[PDB]
Amino acid sequence: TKPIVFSGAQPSGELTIGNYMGALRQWVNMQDDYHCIYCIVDQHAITVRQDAQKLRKATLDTLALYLACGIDPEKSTIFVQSHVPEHAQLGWALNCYTYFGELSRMTQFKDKSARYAENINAGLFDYPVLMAADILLYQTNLVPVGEDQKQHLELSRDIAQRFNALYGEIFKVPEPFIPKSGARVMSLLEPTKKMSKSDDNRNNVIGLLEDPKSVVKKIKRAVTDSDEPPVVRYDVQNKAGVSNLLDILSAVTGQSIPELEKQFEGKMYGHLKGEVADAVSGMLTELQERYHRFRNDEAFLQQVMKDGAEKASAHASRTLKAVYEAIGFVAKPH
Amino acid sequence: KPIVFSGAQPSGELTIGNYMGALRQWVNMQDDYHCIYCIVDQHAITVRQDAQKLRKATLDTLALYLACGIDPEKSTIFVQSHVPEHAQLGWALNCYTYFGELSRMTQFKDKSARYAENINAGLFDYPVLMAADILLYQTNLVPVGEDQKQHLELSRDIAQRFNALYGEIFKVPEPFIPKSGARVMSLLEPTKKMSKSDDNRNNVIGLLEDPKSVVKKIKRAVTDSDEPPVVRYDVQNKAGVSNLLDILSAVTGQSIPELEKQFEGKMYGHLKGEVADAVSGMLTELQERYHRFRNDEAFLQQVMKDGAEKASAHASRTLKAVYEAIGFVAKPH
Ligand SMILES: Nc1ncnc2c1ncn2[C@@H]1O[C@H](COP(=O)(O)OC(=O)[C@@H](N)Cc2c[nH]c3ccccc23)[C@@H](O)[C@H]1O
Ligand SMILES: C[C@H]1c2c[nH]c3cccc(c23)S[C@H]1C(=O)O
C-alpha cells in the first residue's frame, strides 16, 4: 500500500492564491505518487463564529474548488470533517495526552485571540488537538501545508510520539511537507505580512474565485522595492515584493525561479507585474470555468461527499478502535 | 415525564453513604422519572491510569449499579464512549464556551494540583464534555453534589447561549434540589460527610468490603468521652454515637427515639457491634447480586448494547438539530 498523505482546509472565508500555493498545488501533484486524503474541516471553521447559511454554502464552495483545482475523487479521498464522528472522538481522547502549555504557546491561538477578542472560545484553544486527530486517524506519513501550520504539525508529531511511547506503534509519526517556494505567500501592498484569508483590505489578497479583472489591478499595484537600478532578482529578505511576484508567477507557469530570473534580465518591475497579472489572470479564468461546472451540480457534490466519508470512516474507525483498546475502554458490542 | 441524567465515574469506590443516600433515593424513583446513567470512561482518562484497570472498573461500576437496583428495562444505563455523539457535541460546544469560563473553574484549579504546562487539556476541557453529556438527552434534571455545582451552571449557560442564537435546541437543565435524608458521616471525622473520594479509607465503608473488614473500621469509630457511657442522639456533643445511630437507622428503618430506648443501659461496644452487624447484613445481599451480575459477561454485554442503542436514538436526534442549526452540510445517507 502507498504511503498516506492527509491535509485539510477550512470552508471559511474565500481561499486565496496563498492557499493554492502553500497547500492545494501540492495536493494535486501528490495524488498519483501517494494515497491522498483531503478534508474540508468544518469543525475547525466554527471556532470563529460564522453565519450558519454561509457555512453550509461555503462547504460546497470549497469542495467544488478542490475539484476545479484538479483533486480527483477517483484518485483521492475527499470528505467533510463532520461526516466522520471519529475525528471528534479521537480529538477528545488526545486532549488527555496534550499539555495545557503546548496549547497556550500556539502562535495561531495568540493571533486569533487578538483578532477575535469577543469570541476567545475553547475550540480556538483546543484547535491543534482536533487537527492532530484529523491527521493520526489515517496513519498519515505526509501532511502538505503552508508554513503557518508548521507549529501545529509539530505538536501532532509530539502527541503521536507521546501516545506511542505508552501504548506501542498505534500512530505513525507524520512528517510535514512544505514547499520551498510559495510556503508563505505575502500581502500585495505589505509584503512583510502573510496574505491572510481574513484581511480587511482586499487589495492585499488574490482570491481564487475573485474577478480576474479585479485581480490584475491588484497585481499591477503590488509594492516593490526601491533598488537603483531596478533588478528582477529573487531575494526574500531585501526584495520581498519582487520575490513574492516571482513565486506567484512560478506557481502559475511551472518555471523555476532561476529560469524566471534569466527571462527577466534587463527588465524592470512594470514588465514583471504585467507578466504576473497576465499569468494569474489566465489561470483564474480557467479555474473559475471548471469551478462553476462542478459547483452547479450539487447532486455530484453530494455523491463525492458520501463516497468520501465512507472511504474515510473505514480507515478512521480502524485507528480509533486501536486507540480505544490502547487506552482501556470497553469495546462497544456490535 | 422528566429526563434525569447522572454520570457514574468508573473509578468511584462507592461507599454506604452513596448507597443509602443518593442511590437508594433514585432506585426508588425509576418509574417517576426517565433516568439515564452514563459511565463516563471518556472523563476518566483525564487522569492517567492503567488501561486494564480502567477496563475492569468500567465493568465493575456497571455491575455495581445493577446490583444497587438500577433496572436496565426502566432506566437507560450505558458506557459514554459507546455513543460517539458525546465527543461530537462536546467539540461543537467548545466553540460556544469562553476560554475564561473554563479557566475560572474551581474544579480545574483544584484538580490541577500541579503547574500549568504539566496539566493535560482533558482536565481543562472536562466541563464542556459534561455539558455535552447533559444536553444531548434534553435533560430536565441533574443530581449534583456541591463540587459539581459550578459545572452544572456552565452547562445551563451554554444551553441558553446556544438557544439564543439558534432556537430552542437545548432544554436548560435544572439541579435536582431535594436531598436523600439518610445521614452518613466519616468514621473517624464524624463532623464531615462520608465521601467516596476520601484518601483516608478508614473514614469510609465501601460497598464490597467483607464483614471482617467492616468490623475493623466500625470498632475504630470515633466516639465521645462522656461519663457514664450513654447512647443518646445529640450531634453537637455525641456526634460520634450520633453518626452510629444515624447509620444504624439508615440501615434498619428504626427511629432514633426507638434506637435510643433499644440501647438504654447498653455501652458503646454493643452499639458498634450492632452497627457493623446491620451494615454487613445489607452489604451481603448487595455483594451477592454484584457477583452474579459481574461474572455474567454476556449479561453485561447485552445491557451495554441495549443501553447505548437507547441512548443513541436520543443523542443523534439532538446532534442532528445542533449541526443543522450550526450550518454544517448534513451527512449524505
Ligand atoms: N499566505 C499563505 N501562503 C501559503 N500557504 C498558505 C497561506 N495562507 C494559508 N496557507 C495554507 O493554506 C492551507 C489552508 O489553510 P486553512 O486556514 O484553510 O486551514 C488551516 O490553517 C488548517 N488548520 C486546517 C487543518 C485542520 N486540520 C488539518 C490537518 C492537516 C492539515 C491541515 C488541517 C494551510 O495549509 C495553510 O498553511
Ligand atoms: C461523573 C461526572 C460527570 C460526567 N458527566 C456528567 C453529567 C452529569 C453529572 C455528572 C457528570 S457528575 C460528574 C462528577 O464529576 O461527579
Residue numbers in the entry:
A (entry chain B): 2 to 335
B (entry chain A): 3 to 335
The publication says:
Chuangxinmycin (CXM) is a promising antimicrobial compound targeting bacterial tryptophanyl-tRNA synthetase (TrpRS), an essential enzyme in protein synthesis. TrpRS catalyzes the ligation of Trp to its cognate tRNA, forming tryptophanyl-tRNA (Trp-tRNA), which is required for the accurate translation of genetic codes into proteins. Importantly, bacterial TrpRS exhibits significant structural and functional differences compared to its mammalian counterpart, making it an attractive target for the development of selective antibiotics. Structurally, CXM is a tryptophan (Trp) mimic but is characterized by a unique dihydrothiopyran heterocycle, which distinguishes it from other known antibiotics and contributes to its distinct physicochemical properties.
To elucidate the structural details of CXM binding to TrpRS, we determined the crystal structures of EcTrpRS and SaTrpRS in complex with CXM. The structure of the EcTrpRS complex was solved at a resolution of 2.24 Å (ESI†). Its asymmetric unit contains two chains in the open and closed states respectively. Specifically, the nitrogen atom of the indolyl group of CXM forms a hydrogen bond with the carboxyl group of D135 (corresponding to D132 in GsTrpRS, ESI†), and the carboxyl group of CXM forms a hydrogen bond with the phenol group of Y128 (corresponding to Y125 in GsTrpRS, ESI†) in both structures. In addition, the carboxyl group of CXM also forms a hydrogen bond with the residue Q150 of EcTrpRS (3.4 Å) and has a polar interaction with the corresponding Q147 in GsTrpRS (3.6 Å). Conserved residues F7, V42, H45, M132, I136, V144, and V146, located within 4 Å of the CXM carbon skeleton, engage in hydrophobic or π-stacking interactions with CXM (ESI†). CXM not only mimics the natural substrate Trp but also adopts a closed-ring structure that fixes the carboxyl group in a similar orientation to Trp. This conformational locking likely stabilizes the binding of CXM to TrpRS and may enhance its binding affinity compared to the more flexible natural substrate. After simulation, the ligand-binding pose in EcTrpRS/CXM system remained similar to the initial structure, with the hydrogen bond between the indolyl nitrogen atom and D135 carboxylate preserved. In contrast, under lower ATP concentrations, CXM alone can induce the “closed-gate” state of Y128 in the EcTrpRS/CXM complex, suggesting an alternative inhibitory phase.
